[PDB]
């Protein structure tokens, strides 16, 4: 089963049905305006943070499923109809869905009517545009009506959905049907008093009516599929008071055969200075300046195609960084395409919103957000370098930090926690990646601030040493990190012991002491630490540098004589100094976690694949054989049956669900990593098959979700939903696969002084052509690979041999073609 | 005009049409299980907590409201259809509501088949309980088949509408086909962990089939108004794993012609102690004796009547307290069955759960749970005790409190705000008046702690005067009490200057210092303070009571002093000590709560209603021209225009609505029971009428909401939708009018040694007779009444003429019989 495909030359999925298995997605915009848009035009838009500032109301767990979105209502003499499919459920002659990169293009026909419509959000604009295309393809002439609708939400979504004992009453809108380019609407609820915002909606001509009441071109008892106006054949001209603003135009077209008309919508987001609020003295009527000027630039086709094409270009520049051809095309496409976008998105989106983050308690998460940028750092380095300063900018001073920021303010919250042990090293991890990419060291001497108090700031390199600290400074009696709230594993809350229903785990109070430890952190030190110790001897701190060295083979020491099972790695010590992921319990007897990271940090590796005594490989050969399915890697063996006190959130999900056996899609890169560590690149590239998008559309009735973008969790085999996803589009899966993929299977990374050229892919892949820039320089490598395992590439580079597999950075202005062997 | 009428006989309203202008609801149980059932019985139940045992989702702001509740799908011969009409919206031959005391009746008749559902909770039960009969009326045999309905909740309604990312992986069912009475559905997510309760939807019958999944049942792309299983007339026997449980029961059905059958539908709450959560050593099967039993005592139609029949009883002898008999039916209804039955409801429920208030943020309000006590004593006194108790265990020592309180735990919180200045003298109002009512002086010696605190219990009456305390040692420069965050005026914020959009002024961080006083809570000392005062005197306190009153004088003083306008009282000093409420501003110049509650405290009384020197009639005459509506008295008038940024929330509303310039149904009360102060019966009658439920029946299409339960806001006379309610049910207006009608229109108001009867309603009411229960005494009160300006009543009791206005209380069992003449 498949319900579209993949166009390559477009850069696009096609989507060719509307009855998809469930609403299907593209993320729209990439600099501070943002729509969720579904291939049935559902979904809503938002201006920089999805709490805050949302324009459009989207209902999530609707019946059915994405009622609710950009609708535009077509009224062919009394037949009325949607080319979205949804809401109306019409009969369709034609219907198709084609989601690109930044935009989107949805086309439905009916009795003779075409309509087309592109949806995007131009750079360097706050808004989102139709180019509505209506063609009339039969043999007589056609008159119809046609009827955009939105539904405005009232900027604070958490008070939308919750505070209707006050915002019934608040809602305001004005009309202009007689603007500068055409009509518009304006939704101004609360403009009145502390926000200096509104949107707009408007069309690129004047409208024959208007409604900006729901109740009144909905009807009472209709649901939007049922719409009175249209199914009347014309608006009737609503001003909202209060309840439900909307935004709706009707514009009458007539078309003989074969002809058509275009109209351009746009929904944009406008500010004005508090000194330029109001087009008037008493202060009651919106200055529209901004307003017209967002519509004189999408006036006419033109202008459109223009913002479309510059859109295009932008994407092929930022694709242009990293690339690959090889002999497989589902490989290609997403390493060349699909998984670059999604890391762009999840740069932007963290884990706020998407269909199943409903872009309300989470904000932008510090280990979410530190991980991202490990796929977003080739793409806009300057866009990662802001980003990393903001990360930075929610530490507290003693190391540890906000666990997530509001993306609006940027200051930190506990939203959903404090005290994630596991958090403090991520920055390192982010800022050594941008580091090698980059080569710019300056960003260690940027002032930063501790949790923004202006006064506090102090170099970047600084706060890398607090976090680098804090975990020195917080260690068990194994010589193991202490846990806190949980570490990587959100659901691991060993000092908690809840036992009062319906309270969360990651707000409710934490008990003191304990000696609660993680083999998880303990891994993460030894990787990051290193990358600190590097950085440290690079600033010119001798010292600091040999006492960081030390450190890290004291962790790594413990990790060896503590946190080994036997035949696995172990997870945690509890509260009570008891193991946690060892063939002594029943169930969680192993997890994947420290599986993955311990080997990253190269822990426990013998001298080859082949070394059956290597804690690494035994390690791996458990994961393969208690973890392994047919759609990755369940995430431990077996899942909890029952409460377990001691461990917090996790047990309290259904087997093989979640962090309870699903298939956390995240951390499959870290064993995937992990096995090219140990050289079988054959089973990495298996691992890496089992869970991405372009392997996995064969079953898209299985896997349920995007067939283009990873997901955060697949129902593992102790599920009875096995092999279903769910929270797609927004997981660290995209950052960690593009890692993976880009760096370690096909084997090109950048490195502090020079690019590594390391494949490790296995036999399927037998020969490629990597496309590299790096510090400007284009790297042209071209490898010819056995895939035979343990065996690992050699060089030669402009026609000379070299040793080794890292090549010193070229000058920029120079391509460089490496020739690789394996 | 009209969309049902009443039946007093049967005391019960009665919805003759399902086109209603707004969902109309009643609610069912009164103890500690709570549902909210509309007309077309949508809405939900929950435990105790709206919030946190919420049994059934039910969706605010659904297109089309109300699609969403307890259903009935009839599949008649591959013919669908509901007897609530919605979802499925067929043509019925007949459509009736009935809504009662603690039940409703709905019936649809559709080709031959009538279903009628009675709706309710029984007495002593954690239960919803359906008795649907399925009547055929045509002239031949008929079949069906009938298909249950209801969705289910994840209990935690917040996390419900928020964290799908975590809950869709949740839910969990178990299916029992064939239990002891019939087949029953439970829903159990999180009794794997730490939830002791689960629920259970079962019939009195064996079922053909059943369905737990909601996307099943209702199939994909469709509405609850198409779903599938119905119409394909079969079951599907689905069991839910996570995504949305529902209950969902087929029964097949035969009636010869006008042949019934009764099936006994039951939603239920149990519970079991922990050593009997599980049925098997194994802990994954739900323990179902108590469900079973629950099952067992709604095995047959036999015990429904007999519940029913109980549950009649009860409210016969909960409304046979206070009774009238006049020559107004509409005056009769309110008093008789109406304005009681409220009461009732927002005891329990405070301004927690409604077709508006979201069942989330608000719990247990201080201000409000106080108040309801008003209109609550005289129904239950043993729980209105209990209240008072729960109450005040959450203030603090120095008097001041939490301003609401979470109803599952009653331990208070600060979710919508603290500090109000208004909160702490509530407390003795509703203290007072339990006392009056049953003069159980042995509560003022009961031990309460402090902020539930073990070891800081003090008598309630300590309580009591750390509450009187607050405000003498909180007066601000002209001797009025400083202000807080607000008063009983929410919106009235002087410590705020908030620029910040999002950001709730109910919950923001005040300004510390400035000297911004409330004549409102000066108008509140002088009432609650003299009571006060008495409670001393009471128990022996002479200094305390002289030093009491020595206050209330002092602030009476600064009232006529400082907080007069020239023709009505001012209604604030702000930070900067502005008057605020003054002719001299251009907008709200005379906010109407000073004048009723200043008033109600004798206040700038004089010689009688013809005074016109007098301060309170002065007063009273400005209310009436420019706050007076046909509609009810506004706020405050004019509204404010534009953002005044030191008052707060208040011209954040647009002019008309809410507390800015709405009519604030809570607020005309004060004023009423002001006018029969002054002895303006007349006028004080006239505006109970404007705003109570029966006498705006005749335009429930202005009004829209149910035409039997006051509202809390009714659009004013600057609002384009002037005369429109929102916000029904929960509201302290229903106290408050009751407390206004009751006790002193007809006039009949108990006091701490005897029976007040002091009428003051005007010509209207020619003739009446009041009965009262009071200490166990029956009064029976035969008024005869000029109605004469001023003048006032004066009493034989069992034959003998008597001094003044009291009849001190007559022994239990007694019957005096009082003739009263104005
Ligand atoms: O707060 C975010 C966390 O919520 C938990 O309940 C989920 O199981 C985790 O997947 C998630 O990391
Ligand atoms: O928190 C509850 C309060 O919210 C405010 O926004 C409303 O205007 C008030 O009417 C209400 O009392
Ligand atoms: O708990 C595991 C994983 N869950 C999903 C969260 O977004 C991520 O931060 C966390 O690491
Ligand atoms: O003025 C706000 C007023 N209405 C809304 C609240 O229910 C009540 O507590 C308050 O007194």
């Not at 740069?347 to 530190?370: C, K, V």
């Not at 030390?550 to 696995?568: C, F, I, S």
């Not at 694949?609 to 990755?632: F, I, R, Y």
Request: charged share 20%; hydrophobic share 35%.
């Amino acid at each position: 089963m498949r319900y579209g495909h993949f166009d390559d030359a477009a850069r696009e999925y096609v989507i060719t049905t509307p009855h998809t298995p469930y609403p299907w997605i593209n993320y729209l915009g990439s600099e501070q305006f943002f729509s969720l848009l579904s291939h049935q035009a559902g979904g809503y838009s938002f201006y920089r943070d999805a709490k805050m500032r949302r324009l459009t109301r989207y209902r999530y767990n609707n019946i059915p499923a994405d009622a609710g979105g950009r609708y535009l209502y077509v009224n062919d003499g009394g037949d009325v109809w949607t080319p979205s499919w949804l809401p109306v459920k019409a009969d369709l002659d034609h219907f198709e869905a084609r989601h690109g990169l930044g935009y989107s293009r949805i086309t439905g026909e009916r009795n003779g009517l075409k309509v087309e419509t592109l949806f995007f959000v131009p750079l360097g604009e706050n808004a989102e545009v139709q180019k509505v295309t209506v063609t009339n393809t039969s043999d007589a002439p056609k008159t119809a009506t046609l009827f955009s609708f939105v539904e405005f939400c009232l900027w604070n979504a958490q008070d939308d959905q919750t505070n209707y004992q006050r915002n019934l009453s608040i809602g305001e809108v004005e009309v202009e049907q007689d603007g500068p380019h055409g009509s518009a609407i304006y939704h101004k609820t609360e403009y009145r008093e502390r926000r200096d915002h509104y949107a707009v909606f408007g069309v690129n001509t004047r409208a024959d009516g208007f409604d900006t009441d729901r109740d009144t071109f909905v009807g009472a008892y209709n649901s939007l599929g049922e719409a009175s106006v249209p199914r009347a054949g014309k608006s009737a001209d609503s001003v909202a008071s209060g309840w439900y603003p909307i935004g709706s135009h009707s514009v009458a077209v007539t078309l003989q055969p074969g002809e058509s008309r275009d109209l351009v919508y746009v929904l944009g987001y406008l500010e004005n200075p508090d000194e330029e609020k109001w087009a008037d003295d008493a202060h009651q009527v919106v200055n529209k300046a901004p307003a017209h000027a967002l519509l004189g630039r999408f006036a006419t086709s033109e202008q459109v195609d223009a913002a479309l094409e510059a859109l295009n270009s932008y994407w092929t520049n930022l694709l242009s960084t990293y690339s690959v051809s090889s002999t497989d095309e589902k490989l290609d496409r997403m390493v060349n395409i699909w998984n670059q976008y999604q890391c762009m998105v999840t740069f932007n989106m963290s884990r706020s919103a998407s269909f199943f983050e409903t872009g309300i308690g989470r904000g932008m998460g510090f280990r979410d957000s530190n991980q991202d940028l490990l796929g977003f750092v080739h793409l806009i380095p300057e866009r990662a370098r802001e980003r990393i300063i903001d990360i930075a900018s929610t530490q507290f001073a003693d190391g540890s930090a906000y666990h997530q920021y509001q993306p609006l303010t940027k200051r930190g919250n506990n939203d959903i926690g404090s005290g994630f042990n596991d958090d403090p090293l991520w920055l390192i991890a982010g800022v050594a990646a941008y580091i090698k990419e980059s080569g710019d060291w300056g960003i260690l001497d940027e002032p930063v601030p501790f949790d923004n108090e202006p006064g506090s700031e102090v170099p970047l390199f600084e706060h890398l040493t607090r976090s680098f600290q804090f975990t020195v400074q917080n260690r068990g009696p194994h010589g193991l990190p202490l846990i806190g709230r949980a570490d990587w594993n959100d659901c691991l809350n060993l000092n908690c012991f809840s036992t009062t229903p319906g309270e969360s785990f990651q707000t409710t109070e934490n008990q003191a002491g304990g000696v609660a430890e993680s083999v998880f952190i303990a891994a993460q030190f030894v990787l990051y630490g290193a990358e600190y110790a590097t950085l440290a001897e690079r600033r010119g701190l001798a010292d600091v540098a040999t006492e960081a060295r030390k450190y890290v083979d004291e962790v790594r020491a413990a990790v060896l004589e503590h946190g080994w099972d036997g035949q696995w790695f172990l997870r945690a010590y509890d509260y009570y100094g008891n193991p946690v992921g060892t063939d002594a319990k029943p169930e969680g007897k192993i997890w994947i976690e420290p599986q993955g990271f311990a080997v990253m940090a190269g822990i426990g590796v013998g001298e080859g694949p082949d070394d059956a005594d290597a804690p690494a490989v035994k390690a791996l050969d458990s994961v393969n054989e208690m973890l392994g399915t047919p759609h990755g890697l369940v995430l431990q063996y077996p899942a909890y049956t029952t409460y377990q006190i001691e461990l917090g959130e996790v047990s309290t999900y259904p087997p093989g669900y979640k962090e309870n056996g699903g298939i956390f899609c995240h951390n499959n890169p870290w064993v995937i990593i992990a096995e090219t560590v140990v050289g079988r690149g054959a089973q990495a590239f298996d691992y890496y098959k089992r869970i991405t998008p372009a392997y996995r559309e064969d079953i898209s009735d299985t896997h349920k979700l995007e067939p283009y973008v990873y997901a955060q969790m697949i129902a593992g085999k102790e599920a009875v939903r096995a092999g279903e996803a769910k929270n797609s589009w927004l997981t660290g899966t995209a950052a960690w696969n593009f890692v993976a993929v880009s760096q370690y299977l096909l084997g090109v990374r950048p490195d502090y002084d020079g690019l590594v050229v390391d494949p490790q892919i296995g036999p399927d892949v037998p020969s490629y052509t990597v496309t590299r820039v790096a510090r400007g320089a284009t790297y042209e490598i071209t490898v010819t690979n056995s895939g035979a395992p343990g065996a690992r590439a050699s060089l030669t580079v402009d026609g000379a041999p070299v040793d080794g597999r890292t090549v010193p950075y070229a000058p920029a202005g120079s391509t460089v073609r490496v020739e690789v062997t394996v």
